[PDB]
Amino acid sequence: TVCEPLGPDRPVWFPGTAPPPWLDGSLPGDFGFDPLGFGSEPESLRWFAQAELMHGRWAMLAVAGILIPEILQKWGFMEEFSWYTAGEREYFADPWTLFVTQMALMGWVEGRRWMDYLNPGSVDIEPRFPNRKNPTPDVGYPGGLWFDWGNWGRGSPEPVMVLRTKEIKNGRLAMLAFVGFWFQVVYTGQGPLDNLFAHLADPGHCNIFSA
Amino acid sequence: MRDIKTYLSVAPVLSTLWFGALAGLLIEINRLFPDALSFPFF
Amino acid sequence: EVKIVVDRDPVKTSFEEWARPGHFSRTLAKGPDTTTWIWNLHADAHDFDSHTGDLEEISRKVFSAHFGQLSIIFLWLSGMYFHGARFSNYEAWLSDPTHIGPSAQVVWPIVGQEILNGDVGGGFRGIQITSGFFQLWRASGITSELQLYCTAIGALVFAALMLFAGWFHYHKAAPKLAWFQDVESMLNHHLAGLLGLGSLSWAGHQIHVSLPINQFLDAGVDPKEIPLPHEFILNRDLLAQLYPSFAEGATPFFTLNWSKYAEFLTFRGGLDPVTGGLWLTDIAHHHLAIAILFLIAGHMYRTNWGIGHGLKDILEAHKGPFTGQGHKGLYEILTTSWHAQLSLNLAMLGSTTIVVAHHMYSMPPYPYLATDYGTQLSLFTHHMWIGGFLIVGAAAHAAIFMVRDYDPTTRYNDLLDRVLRHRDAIISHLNWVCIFLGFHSFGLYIHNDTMSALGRPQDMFSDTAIQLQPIFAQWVQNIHATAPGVTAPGATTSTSLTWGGGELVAVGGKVALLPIPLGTADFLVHHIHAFTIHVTVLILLKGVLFARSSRLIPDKANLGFRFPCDGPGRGGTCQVSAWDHVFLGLFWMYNAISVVIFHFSWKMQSDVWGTISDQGVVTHITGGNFAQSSITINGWLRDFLWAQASQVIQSYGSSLSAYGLFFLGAHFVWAFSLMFLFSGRGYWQELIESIVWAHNKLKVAPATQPRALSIIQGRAVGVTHYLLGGIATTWAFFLARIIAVG
Amino acid sequence: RQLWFASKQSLTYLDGTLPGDFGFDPLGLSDPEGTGGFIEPRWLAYGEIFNGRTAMMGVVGMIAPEALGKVGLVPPETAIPWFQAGAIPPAGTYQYWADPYTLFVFEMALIGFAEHRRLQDWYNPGSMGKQYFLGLEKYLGGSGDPAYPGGPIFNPLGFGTKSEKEMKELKLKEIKNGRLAMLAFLGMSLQAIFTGVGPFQNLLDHLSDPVNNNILTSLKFH
Numbered sequence A: 001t002v003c004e005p006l007g008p009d010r011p012v013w014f015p016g017t018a019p020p021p022w023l024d025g026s027l028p029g030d031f032g033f034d035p036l037g038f039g040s041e042p043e044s045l046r047w048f049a050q051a052e053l054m055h056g057r058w059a060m061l062a063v064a065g066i067l068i069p070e071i072l073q074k075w076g077f078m079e080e081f082s083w084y085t086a087g088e089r090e091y092f093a094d095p096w097t098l099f100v101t102q103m104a105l106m107g108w109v110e111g112r113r114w115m116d117y118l119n120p121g122s123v124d125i126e127p128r129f130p131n132r133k134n135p136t137p138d139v140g141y142p143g144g145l146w147f148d149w150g151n152w153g154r155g156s157p158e159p160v161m162v163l164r165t166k167e168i169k170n171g172r173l174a175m176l177a178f179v180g181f182w183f184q185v186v187y188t189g190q191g192p193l194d195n196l197f198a199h200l201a202d203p204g205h206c207n208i209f210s211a
Numbered sequence B: 001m002r003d004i005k006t007y008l009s010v011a012p013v014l015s016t017l018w019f020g021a022l023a024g025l026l027i028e029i030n031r032l033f034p035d036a037l038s039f040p041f042f
Numbered sequence C: 001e002v003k004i005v006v007d008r009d010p011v012k013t014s015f016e017e018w019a020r021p022g023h024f025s026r027t028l029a030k031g032p033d034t035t036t037w038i039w040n041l042h043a044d045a046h047d048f049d050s051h052t053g054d055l056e057e058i059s060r061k062v063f064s065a066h067f068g069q070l071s072i073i074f075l076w077l078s079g080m081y082f083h084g085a086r087f088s089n090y091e092a093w094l095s096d097p098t099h100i101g102p103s104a105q106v107v108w109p110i111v112g113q114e115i116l117n118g119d120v121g122g123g124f125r126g127i128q129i130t131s132g133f134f135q136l137w138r139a140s141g142i143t144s145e146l147q148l149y150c151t152a153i154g155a156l157v158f159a160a161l162m163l164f165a166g167w168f169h170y171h172k173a174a175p176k177l178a179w180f181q182d183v184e185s186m187l188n189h190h191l192a193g194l195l196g197l198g199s200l201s202w203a204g205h206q207i208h209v210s211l212p213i214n215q216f217l218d219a220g221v222d223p224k225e226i227p228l229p230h231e232f233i234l235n236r237d238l239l240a241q242l243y244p245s246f247a248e249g250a251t252p253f254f255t256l257n258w259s260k261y262a263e264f265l266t267f268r269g270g271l272d273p274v275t276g277g278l279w280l281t282d283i284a285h286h287h288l289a290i291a292i293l294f295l296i297a298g299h300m301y302r303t304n305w306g307i308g309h310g311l312k313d314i315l316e317a318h319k320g321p322f323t324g325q326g327h328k329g330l331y332e333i334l335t336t337s338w339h340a341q342l343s344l345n346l347a348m349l350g351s352t353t354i355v356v357a358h359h360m361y362s363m364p365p366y367p368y369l370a371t372d373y374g375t376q377l378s379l380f381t382h383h384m385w386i387g388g389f390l391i392v393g394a395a396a397h398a399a400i401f402m403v404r405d406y407d408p409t410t411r412y413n414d415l416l417d418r419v420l421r422h423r424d425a426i427i428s429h430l431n432w433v434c435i436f437l438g439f440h441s442f443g444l445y446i447h448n449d450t451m452s453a454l455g456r457p458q459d460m461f462s463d464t465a466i467q468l469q470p471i472f473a474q475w476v477q478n479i480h481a482t483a484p485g486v487t488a489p490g491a492t493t494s495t496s497l498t499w500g501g502g503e504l505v506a507v508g509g510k511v512a513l514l515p516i517p518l519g520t521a522d523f524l525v526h527h528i529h530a531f532t533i534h535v536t537v538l539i540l541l542k543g544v545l546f547a548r549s550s551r552l553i554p555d556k557a558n559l560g561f562r563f564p565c566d567g568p569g570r571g572g573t574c575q576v577s578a579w580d581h582v583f584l585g586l587f588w589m590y591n592a593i594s595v596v597i598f599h600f601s602w603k604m605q606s607d608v609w610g611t612i613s614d615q616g617v618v619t620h621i622t623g624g625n626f627a628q629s630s631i632t633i634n635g636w637l638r639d640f641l642w643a644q645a646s647q648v649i650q651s652y653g654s655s656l657s658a659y660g661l662f663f664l665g666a667h668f669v670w671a672f673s674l675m676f677l678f679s680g681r682g683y684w685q686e687l688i689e690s691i692v693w694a695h696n697k698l699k700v701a702p703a704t705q706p707r708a709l710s711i712i713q714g715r716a717v718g719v720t721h722y723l724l725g726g727i728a729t730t731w732a733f734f735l736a737r738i739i740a741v742g
Numbered sequence D: 001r002q003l004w005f006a007s008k009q010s011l012t013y014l015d016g017t018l019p020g021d022f023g024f025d026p027l028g029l030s031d032p033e034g035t036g037g038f039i040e041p042r043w044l045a046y047g048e049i050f051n052g053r054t055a056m057m058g059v060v061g062m063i064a065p066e067a068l069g070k071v072g073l074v075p076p077e078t079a080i081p082w083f084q085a086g087a088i089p090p091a092g093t094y095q096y097w098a099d100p101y102t103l104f105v106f107e108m109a110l111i112g113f114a115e116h117r118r119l120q121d122w123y124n125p126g127s128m129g130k131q132y133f134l135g136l137e138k139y140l141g142g143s144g145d146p147a148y149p150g151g152p153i154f155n156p157l158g159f160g161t162k163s164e165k166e167m168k169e170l171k172l173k174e175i176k177n178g179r180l181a182m183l184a185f186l187g188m189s190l191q192a193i194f195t196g197v198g199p200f201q202n203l204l205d206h207l208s209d210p211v212n213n214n215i216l217t218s219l220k221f222h
């Protein structure tokens, strides 16, 4: 736990501006950007931090699942066609069965996680053979060799706050990427790589303003 | 922030949202069961 | 002199207060010990002058409130333009507007209301409208849904901008006193700046966009290939093709030989048979001349320089023998009390709304407007209602000023002093005039009805019997019909067609306007109007003049503006506050407006509106029985009220069926009002007491102690419900009848 | 203070604070009874400086291409009036190294970067030389006053050697040239809106034929 208070250690998102006082910069990925001041009170602050982390991780997974199969279609062996139209793809089972199974299992898991949030340490999975003392928690970073078997979130590979900063920044970027992909498919009728190459060929004209 | 929460807990806005939700439920039921005169379940 | 002085950031945009209701009132902020608290909260929210004692803060508050109002108006305009864009048949309507009903509202097919989306023609289904936007959108050459769409967007932008401006000007940069209190520059601008330049820019938009596209549409073209507006200003050759003079740039104007432009700026008058509307050349000349007039008017008062008058330097000179010192000091009164200004402006605005209502029907400005019957009728009656309400508000706020902020020690005057010094004479003579008019304008109807039901028709009041002739009105009509001969050579016909001379204008087998004759029935109805107006004036003027102190209660003013009574003493003192005077006058204003609008409907549907045959024979919508059936109340029942109420009552199971349903609820509320207007309070208090007992027995007695409404609020809810019932009844009646038959 | 059409509300605040006060303001805007935001006299001098500078650059640039085309060697591919270059679609256009619209929003974003940073400096002077900027940090402190930034990035050759008088001259020169360029730009644009042929060709005209005098015609056309 390292703090990033005002000064050179605090590169303000808006140069020449004093960041909101209740934005200390402890949470990695902070730059003093909350003009709406939603993080005014601490309970809301931590709640929004958890929401941000979850959104970032899910958005990373979603953008990977969009990107990789489409390029492996374009040039790779197997041809995974339009992902936006894969939502209605036909499988062995009906979409509602898939939906209810997803909801059951994810409700189980996310409910256990919800109780962990409301009551830290009271719902954890970390066995204890004798004489080896286990690690604690920092909710949002469960620890133990279930979700950190590489021993990366604790020390050695990088000071923690730096790696969490990497994570939150990449997650914000991935959120932008997902909303961009979706909005493009709303407007255009291709995948992300197709729009990409179309822009590469004609950067000067092949844009949103092409029509 | 908490001020806007206590403000949102003031009866006008709470009542408006509650009534909107109830009316939406009723109109959706009517959509999924047109003219619904009797109780043809038992 | 005058500068830009303001102040910085009085109040911070903090939600600290929104969770604490009634922060403004010290008593209200304590807590709701009972239930009357939540009535009193809304009841005094906007009461700014009872929240401070200095005019600076309330002036800032009203400055922000005006922005709120303007934001709401802009949002409404945006909604209108949107619903015209995405949900209307406007293009099909433009294709041919003779027999295609303007519809601009569809309803969702959920609960059987699909029938609401009735047949309106042009391959469309939707609730028919009567707002009359379509004549405007055809005047301004919209002729494309893209234009409505982008206009709605721009309106939304302006709305958000105004809301911002509001927030900023109250919270961040609050204006100061020497800005507000400086009325000289405000008059100067608003005269020259707002109105003048407004009409000028509109004349611009008309001569450079509307006029050519409208002339093309009158020539008859599908608006698809009609040249776009900007392509009429960029390439000059189009307008050149239209108007030779218009291809001469700007030399004929600057060089003072303006007559060259005579083609598109002219003084024809009359109406345009192609659409019955006004010759857009005329309306353009009008708007432009008005712009110039306002601009030359705006330069009156000294503001910073050495030229110009001062509103203090104008009054004090006027001082006649009878009145004495004249208007000395009045400038201070009308600059130190907002309520005075609110009253004056509300009165003038109500009068202007009424005169707009009048001038509308008799001189249809828009094209294809005098042939969409329901639109004309509904517009006229709406404007009449708005004017009436504004006038009553003017009187009420004048009374409020008389109570609170009037004082001779510092806000002195020698004119109002005299006026108040002989109030009794004024009220007495107005009362006697009211009695006289009531008798000789209603007893005439009573006599006529009686002598009818007694089989003595040749002793009636009509043209076929003992005769009363409105000679002055026919005199004026003759003058207006013979004036374009000598007095106004520059004109072509009479100023309108309703003057008793000329021909008739009919489009699509229907007539739009023609001469209007006046029979004895018109004399009687005019005197009824005069009487009812005099009585409303009596009520409101008595309230204002006696708001300070009456010969019944000596110190009424000390008891405040709005209080229920002064106890049952001295034989009973119910309804003595000016507030109750306004409560009374409201009903009489309602009655005046109701009889006026009924008269208008009958006269139009019996002497002007209707259809024209192929040969040219006219068969009016109702058969022209006015001059023979408006002179008996029993007639009003039979010929007009009963008969023309058919289309609303058979309306079930049709598109118009909605107009049917209201026709009952309108009546119902109308009933309901009596329950509050007749009863008192103590009875309801005891009943509420017994109900509280019945609940408390079950451990349900709420801490928000139930309380029957206070007296004044009872009267208020009663009068509101009554006005709602009456206006909704006449509204449903009018719409159903006219849109079904017409 | 060469008085040309002054007033007293001018002299209420125009007490000689701007370099070379001439005393010309009938209206009396910046009266300091209540200081209007962006009506501050400091902000007024700032605005005149910035506007005049931009106008100098614009009057050079808008006229440069076609003019040079006359007896010069910039090709006739761009022999086009500034008001016909393409900025005014009802006049002309050109096929460029991008499309029109995205080009405009891109240059808008760049100018926005520059002027946003300059404004942030205006509010808090010197406060740009704190944050990481991939270099450039040890230069953007300026010369204190946002009016006059200085700095070897904006002071390459080196003037005002050991002086404020030399700065006063150079600087009067600044205000005079700014106002002159403003006049010339406005005139070129008005001719363009009323003549319709282009400034440099208007010089081509007014070198020989005196009888032109097109205020006599007042012909208003595209």
Ligand code: CLA
Pocket (backbone or CB within 6 Å): A176, A177, A179, A180, A181, A183, A184, A187, A188, A194, A195, A196, A198, A199, A206, A207, A208, A209
């Ligand atoms: C990571 C951000 C990102 C990136 C790299 C792109 C890239 C692209 N978009 Mg795109 N887009 C984005 C976000 C992004 N978008 C978002 C958030 C939206 C929702 C509004 C859209 C909506 C959108 C539409 C509707 C269309 C594109 C299209 C395109 C392609 C042509 C460029 C163009 O005309 O659009 C320019 C894109 C925008 C104006 C969107 C603005 C939003 C982004 C975030 C701008 C901010 C820049 C970013 C933060 C800085 C770079 C970060 C990182 C990449 C280094 C191009 C491959 C077009 C296409 O399909 O290609 C043929 C197209 O029709 N975009």
